[PDB]
């Protein structure tokens, strides 16, 4: 590992390893890439927390290799769910297609831990995970005259966070 | 002027204070029999007169200074042994409302020689340790039987200690005296 | 095993170039960049410093993560503003 | 108290297909995906007590 | 009596893992000699989830067979040396201790209670107040106060030993011809170095290893640490020793060569320690310092 | 039989005897508990091995067992030393051994003291369990009675005074009861193994350990660990628990009051309020109206009046959040809801049932609304009856309910509604280049005036000491212009809903200062605050 490491390009060598069945689209191997390898969780009890995990979103035209590539992360990556969080816990996951279940990922976005009250029951969850979704613009092909929020069914802080 | 705390009683320390001004007997170990003490509080031929081994009386806190020191030993009051404290203990149980006739002194007397003479007792101390105590929870209980007769008069008292009154002195007198407020209020 | 760090030297720049982004979005009148920009520079830094096994981030680390948030953020804007962003914007898309 | 012996490496497989009634207090090797699981509970070892784990 | 830190305190278990002289013989900073720690308790008899409960609540019956387990198992891993006698104290029924945990008790007190010239003040001032923190817990009315001392000896012990793995680890120490160099430039915390006390400490533990591991080369040791408020290194001049169980005694020569070097040099230095075998040395001098200093025949 | 009495002596005999330094610790502590009548008594493992180490070996071994003996010693204890009648004491242990994850619990612990912790999660509510009962024989009509103790027993058969084979019923009418309570304990969350749900437990306490607890929080627990009936040969697992672990001063308002005749105290709270954020004064002037409101009142004929304050922002997502934490009671929200409910309430389905959103669960305190554009269709009409009569009321599908709604509503958004507000004001920018230097800067230092909880508490002390009245002078200025701006407008609207909103902010004002009457110098800066425009 060292011995690689220490040659020059070692970066880019493994984003052309990433997803090898699949020509072209580059920028996304990388984003892919960054994601699976993430960064580091920092917090200050002094008001303010960073998480380590990257979240990616994809807009994907029809048969432009979306899903094969998420089908080639759930083969990578150590541990993932494919589409529950809870089996995402420090892993991966991931979203082919796409109001509860955004309704949970909005929680999910802005917390890293889950909380959830029933019958007078209390009990808390960890989702702690990196997220890789990928959705179709608003019907059948995406209209690059206008910005995103035309092209997708989202709310303002999910395209922020 | 004087602190709120010491309007209408006395502090522990000077209860402490007034039970130190006792006599007290006492083996010495050196003689000053033929400077000298010239004392003004106090007898002051005792103190120029002792001889080695002798026994002799002297105020207590003269007793507790010297017995600082290895110059002197403290002999223990007769009341204070485990057989009259078992005797004591007995009377208590046996008449269930009269308070036995133990010395004014005797809760402060104790919890002084236990620390500064604990060499000198001939009981073992951890039975006197135990009889005390026994002897302080009878009495409380018998207290508190008595305090179902505050009234608009009058009290009697017998053989309670000195420190065990003064425990108790801010509560009766202060609820006693609001009886009689009452009470003289519909007279008037 | 790897878990990168910063170093404090070239944080100067990364503070004067997210400044200048503001300024340049707000000249425009786009949508403004923010704090969560801002962290996600670093925290894909801390990423590419991972992937070659440095316990260091990099100039070329910050580098290459302003370039990926840098052209995610103009992807996502109107065509007119669009061209505004990339011609102002090509010494952080293309240069450095 | 006591030690018990782990058997691996048995040379032959059924997959739950091939198991008959000549099968029955013979050794056999399986494979397959577990469905379902309980939570574990001790359970009585002789019929003075003594316990062990059961799932 | 028994050379494990702190048994009375903690558990059997840390007892072992802990102990200076443990370490030297089944070399705990690496994994071959854990499993050696583990097979021994294995085979004494003990269940380990046992060995680790807190001695006061062990069970009564492993408590009074000790003495007569150590007998048949200590030989075979060549650690005879454990036994020992020594003093005991107990008083009414707050338990019993021996000197030689009270002694580790004090000690930690001392290191742990609670431009240039002014920081050196503080520093020299706050390190005065522990003797006073000190002076107090030697009453037996205030044995609150030493409970906190014990506790204090636990986490010191603890900082010390994944100090030493580190430096073994990573091998810094430097193998020069008439003495040993090791000098710390970095760590988890490098601010408990600071302390006198708490050098010696590490010292002590660095010369065990070194005493044991192999049977050559009885050498002088030199230790430094970095401060990053002074820029300067509070350097320890370091004896070796023999093994336990083994004749005139040895002496500390540091003292005249620091002497030496320090009268000659241009280097900026400072010498006001009781022990003379401790001084500090600005960061660009050590180099310096350390030249003329093996380039002498005084060493 | 002789080994009952020797047990139960020698516990007595600690009791009577366990000195540390000069005090009776136990003595003391059972005389105390008696006088607030209390009947139990808290022992400490490590005093008990200290005093002597084979009790607390026999402890140890057989605990369902031994510890009714030691509960009875209390008892015989407690009579001497307060009697020249009592029940059965309960005995509570403290102990510092080694702690037990949830997790490893297993068969090898079975009837052994246990000391574990993690988080409450459910709470039964109390039953009654017999502890002295009596008996009647149906045949012969004879009479007895039996003492049960509640460790791990079923009615005799063994008939008196033939007799039958089953003659005997209880006497309600003469027996003696205690409380008992059911419990669950969840594993700490920072244990788990990751992609699993945590493992629980279930627990019973009974007497004083009952109603000690409340759903949510963590907890240390000390019981013993056991089995009941309820696969062969195969039983469940609990536990007994025998121990648990888990207005303003003088000096404070001292402080408020120092602070309430401070010359620019105003001033200070302004600028104390999202400090970070360039310039807009009068919004963060307007947010210190909205934290202290107005003056309730009720009159003779019933009608009453508001006493809230509304406020419309039109950099802002930052002032809601810095709201919501200096407020003493807070609640945040996007314009869609939490749920169907939406902000307000609805009606859903299988009967139907009614819930309310983020109007309803804010009562009492203040509400803050994210995107107030986002707002639903039924929440666009029912804000109305929540802003004007702190009021929402349903009548469908047979519900017929009203719900209370009295909370202060701050709000944003990028109309006829901007009518029910209070104050509207539109956010300002500036671009200083230092300014975002700063913040990249500190946003790195985390990567690598008055204080809030100072102010809150100020707020808080306000809200409760004073509630202030105007004073004539203010009456008139107030009523000549109203009729002065109304008289303007007319020559060129102005209405009663608008005048009784200036009277509160006028109010709002008066408050800081703890004067008991408002001024002319309050009315005069709320009609320059007036200016929303
Ligand atoms: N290099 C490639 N580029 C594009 N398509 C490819 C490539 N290689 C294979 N394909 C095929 O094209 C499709 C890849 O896009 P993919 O998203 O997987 O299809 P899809 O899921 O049916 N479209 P969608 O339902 O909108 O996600 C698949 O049918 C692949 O078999
Ligand atoms: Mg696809
Ligand atoms: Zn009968």
Known sequence: FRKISRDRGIIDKIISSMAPSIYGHRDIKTAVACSLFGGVPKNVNGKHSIRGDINVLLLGDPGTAKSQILKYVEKTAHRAVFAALVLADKGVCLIDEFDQDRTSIHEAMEQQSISISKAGIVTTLQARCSIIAAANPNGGRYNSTLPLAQNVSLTEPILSR | SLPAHLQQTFSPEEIQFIVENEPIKIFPRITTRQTRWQLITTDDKALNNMVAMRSTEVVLWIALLLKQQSKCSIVAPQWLTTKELDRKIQYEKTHPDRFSELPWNWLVLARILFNKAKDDFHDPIHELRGKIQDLREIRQIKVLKGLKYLNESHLQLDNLSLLEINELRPFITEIMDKLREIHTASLT | KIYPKLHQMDMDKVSRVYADLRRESISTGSFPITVRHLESILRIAESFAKMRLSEFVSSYDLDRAIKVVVDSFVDAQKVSVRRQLRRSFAIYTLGH | SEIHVRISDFPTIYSLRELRESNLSSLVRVTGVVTRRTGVFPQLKYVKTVYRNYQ | ?299 | DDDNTEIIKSFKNFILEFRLDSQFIYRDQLRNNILVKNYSLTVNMEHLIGYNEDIYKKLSDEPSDIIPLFETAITQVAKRISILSLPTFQLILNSNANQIPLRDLDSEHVSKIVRLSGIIISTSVLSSRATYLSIMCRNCRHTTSITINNFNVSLPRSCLSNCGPDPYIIIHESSKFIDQQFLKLQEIPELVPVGEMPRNLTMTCDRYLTNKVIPGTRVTIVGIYSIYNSGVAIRTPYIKILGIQSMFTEEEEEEFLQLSRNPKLYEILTNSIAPSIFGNEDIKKAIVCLLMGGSKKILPDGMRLRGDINVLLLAKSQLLKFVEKVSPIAVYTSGKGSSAAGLTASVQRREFYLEGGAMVLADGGVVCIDEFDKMRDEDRVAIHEAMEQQTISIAKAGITTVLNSRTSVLAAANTTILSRFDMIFIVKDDHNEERDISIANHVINIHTEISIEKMKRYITYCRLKCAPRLSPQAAEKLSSNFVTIRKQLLINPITIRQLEAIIRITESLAKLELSPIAQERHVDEAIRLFQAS
């Open chain 5, 1 to 299: 009596d028994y050379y494990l830190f702190l048994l009375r305190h903690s558990s059997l278990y840390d007892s072992f893992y802990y102990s200076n002289y443990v370490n030297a013989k089944l070399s705990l900073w690496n994994e071959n000699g854990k499993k050696r720690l583990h097979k021994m308790f294995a085979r004494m008899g003990i269940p380990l989830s046992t060995a680790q409960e807190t001695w006061l609540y062990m069970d009564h019956s492993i408590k009074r067979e000790l003495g007569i387990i150590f007998d048949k198992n200590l030989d075979r891993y060549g650690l005879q040396d454990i036994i020992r006698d020594g003093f005991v104290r107990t008083l009414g029924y707050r338990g019993s201790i021996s000197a030689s945990e009270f002694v580790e008790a004090l000690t930690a007190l001392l290191e742990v209670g609670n431009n240039s010239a002014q920081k050196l003040t503080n520093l020299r001032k706050r390190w005065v107040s522990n003797f006073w923190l000190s002076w107090d817990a030697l009453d037996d009315r205030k044995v609150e106060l030493l409970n906190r001392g014990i506790q204090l000896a636990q986490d010191l012990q603890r900082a010390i030993f994944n100090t030493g793995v580190a430096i073994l680890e990573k091998k810094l120490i430097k193998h020069l011809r008439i003495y040993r160099l090791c000098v710390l430039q970095d760590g988890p915390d490098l601010d408990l170095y600071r302390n006198p006390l708490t050098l010696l400490r590490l010292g002590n533990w660095l010369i065990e290893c070194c005493a044991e591991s192999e049977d050559k080369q009885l050498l002088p040791m030199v230790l430094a640490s970095i401060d990053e408020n002074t820029d300067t290194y509070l350097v320890a001049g370091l004896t070796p020793r023999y093994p336990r169980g083994l004749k005139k005694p040895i002496l500390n020569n540091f003292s005249m060569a620091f002497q030496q070097i320090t009268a000659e040099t241009d280097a900026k230095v400072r010498i006001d320690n009781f022990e003379s075998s401790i001084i500090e040395i600005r960061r660009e001098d050590l180099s310096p310092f350390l030249e003329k200093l093996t380039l002498s025949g005084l060493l």
